[PDB]
Design a protein around this ligand. Structure first.
Ligand SMILES: OC[C@H]1O[C@@H](OC[C@H]2O[C@@H](O)[C@H](O)[C@@H](O)[C@H]2O)[C@H](O)[C@@H](O)[C@H]1O
Length: 410
C-alpha cells in the first residue's frame, strides 16, 4: 500500500535520481535538503529524540554512520547485501558496517583533489598544475591574495571535516576504536599528522591568507567560486556536481589536480563521502530500502556519476562513462563542460588510488565535529593557536566518551 516515502539528503544528484525512480515505479519520493552535514544531523537528532518526524531515508556520511548505528537509529539491512562486498569499493563497503552489520548503502566516495580556478591562478602568476607540496600551496596562497584584499586561495571558517581529512593526508590517525567499539583512544595532541597540518594551516591563518568569513555550503561560498575570490578548493571528489549546479558562472575556468602533500610524497585522504540509510523508525522499511537500492546499486549509480559524483562501486571505475567523462550533466540534464574539456576522472581515479589506509572515525563523530567550532573557532576568527584549540577539543571528546559509556584513553 506504500505509495510515498520521505528522504532527507543534500547530494545534488538525488533530485534527478529520485525523479527517475518515481517514473520507473510510481512511488512518490518526497525529497528534502534540510541542510548539509551537521545541519542535517541536528534535524535527524531532533526527530529521533522526539520519536516523530524522521524521514524514512537519510543521507548519512561515512564518518557519521558509527554514531547513528551504535545508538540503534539505523535499520540493519545486512540480509539484503549478500554480494555487495563484490560490488562496492573496499573503503565505502567497510564504512557501512558496524559490529558485523550493514546499516546503509554507499552512494559516493570522497578521495580528495585540488580543484582550482585556472583563470585566477594564471592571472596571479601561479601554475595550478605545479602545486605538489604544502609549501607550494603556501607560496601560491600569497600570490593569490596579492591580487587584492578580497581574493583568497580558498576559504575555511573552521571546518572539522577538513581538519580531520588533512590530518589523514599527513599520515595521522588520532582516533582508535577496538573491543566491539567499547575502547577508544584519542591522541590529537600527540599525533604527527595533526601536528604537521597545524603547522601548515597556522601559517596561512597567521598571514591572513585564508578567507575565514565565508562558511562552506553557503551562497557566498558558491559566489566566491564564481567571482574568483575563492580561487580553489582542497576537497572531496564529489565537488564537480556542486560546481556545475551551484557555481555555474565559472564553468570552463576550473581544473582538477592531485592534492598537494606535506613533502610531495604520494598520499591522499578522503573528505566526505556518503551512504543512504533506512531509519530504524521507518514504518516503510521495504519501500525505503527499495529506493536506496536503486540509487546506490541499481541504475541510479550511472546517473550519479554522469551528474558529477565520484563512484562507490568497482565497475564504475572501469566504465567508459567514468573514465572518459569530460562534461557533467546538471540538474536539468544539460551537459556542462565545467573543466574546459579535462578528463577529470583520470585525476580523480588516481586520487582514489593514492588514499592512505588505516584511518578511523570516532564512534561519535556527529558530536565531535559538531563541537569542533566551540574549541577551534577562535583559531579561525581570532588569534588562538590551532594547537591550543585542539587540546581543548581532545579533552572535551575524552570526557564525552566516558560519559557515554566508552572506556577512553589518550
Ligand atoms: O555533493 C555533496 C557532497 O557533500 C559532502 O558533505 C559535505 C562535506 O563538507 C565539507 O565542508 C566537509 O569537510 C566534509 O566532511 C563533508 O561534510 C558529502 O560528504 C558528499 O558525500 C556529497 O554528498
Amino acid at each position: 500500500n506504500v505509495k510515498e516515502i520521505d528522504v532527507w539528503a543534500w547530494d545534488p544528484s538525488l533530485k534527478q535520481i529520485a525523479a527517475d525512480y518515481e517514473k520507473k515505479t510510481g512511488i512518490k519520493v518526497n525529497l528534502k535538503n534540510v541542510g548539509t552535514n551537521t545541519k542535517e544531523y541536528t534535524q535527524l537528532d531532533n526527530a529521533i529524540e522526539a520519536g516523530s518526524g524522521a524521514p524514512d531515508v537519510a543521507q548519512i556520511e561515512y564518518y557519521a554512520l558509527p554514531q547513528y548505528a551504535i545508538k540503534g537509529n539505523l535499520l540493519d539491512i545486512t540480509d539484503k547485501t549478500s554480494g555487495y562486498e563484490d560490488f562496492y569499493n573496499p573503503g565505502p563497503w567497510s564504512s557501512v558496517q558496524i559490529d558485523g552489520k550493514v546499516y546503509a548503502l554507499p552512494i559516493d566516495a570522497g578521495p580528495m583533489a585540488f580543484f582550482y580556478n585556472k583563470e585566477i591562478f594564471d592571472k596571479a602568476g601561479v601554475d595550478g598544475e605545479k602545486i605538489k607540496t604544502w609549501d607550494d600551496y603556501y607560496e601560491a596562497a600569497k600570490k593569490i591574495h596579492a591580487l587584492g584584499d578580497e581574493y583568497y586561495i580558498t576559504s575555511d571558517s573552521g571546518d572539522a571535516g577538513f581538519f580531520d581529512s588533512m590530518t589523514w593526508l599527513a599520515g595521522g590517525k588520532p582516533f582508535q576504536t577496538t573491543n566491539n567499539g567499547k575502547d577508544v583512544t584519542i591522541n590529537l595532541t600527540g599525533d604527527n599528522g595533526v601536528k604537521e597540518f597545524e603547522k601548515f594551516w597556522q601559517k596561512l591563518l597567521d598571514e591572513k591568507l585564508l578567507d575565514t568569513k565565508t562558511v562552506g555550503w553557503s551562497e557566498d561560498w558558491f559566489k566566491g567560486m564564481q567571482d574568483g575570490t575563492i580561487a580553489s578548493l582542497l576537497t572531496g571528489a564529489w565537488m564537480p556536481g556542486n560546481l556545475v549546479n551551484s557555481a555555474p558562472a565559472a564553468a570552463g575556468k576550473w581544473r582538477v589536480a592531485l592534492m598537494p602533500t606535506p613533502n610531495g610524497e604520494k598520499a591522499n585522504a578522503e573528505n566526505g563521502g556518503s551512504s543512504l540509510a533506512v531509519l530504524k523508525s521507518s514504518p516503510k522499511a521495504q519501500a525505503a530500502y527499495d529506493f536506496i537500492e536503486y540509487v546506490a546499486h541499481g541504475d541510479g549509480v550511472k546517473t550519479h556519476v554522469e551528474t558529477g559524483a565520484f563512484p562507490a562501486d568497482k565497475a564504475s571505475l572501469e566504465a567508459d562513462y567514468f573514465k572518459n567523462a569530460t562534461t557533467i550533466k546538471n540538474s536539468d540534464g544539460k551537459e556542462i563542460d565545467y573543466f574546459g574539456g579535462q578528463k577529470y576522472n583520470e585525476v580523480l581515479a588516481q586520487a582514489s588510488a593514492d588514499v592512505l589506509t588505516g584511518y578511523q572515525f570516532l564512534p561519535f563523530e556527529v558530536k565531535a565535529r559538531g563541537v569542533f567550532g566551540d574549541y577551534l573557532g577562535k583559531s579561525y576568527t581570532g588569534n588562538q593557536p590551532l594547537s591550543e584549540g585542539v587540546a581543548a577539543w581532545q579533552k572535551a571528546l575524552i570526557d564525552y566518551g566516558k560519559e557515554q559509556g566508552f572506556t577512553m584513553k589518550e
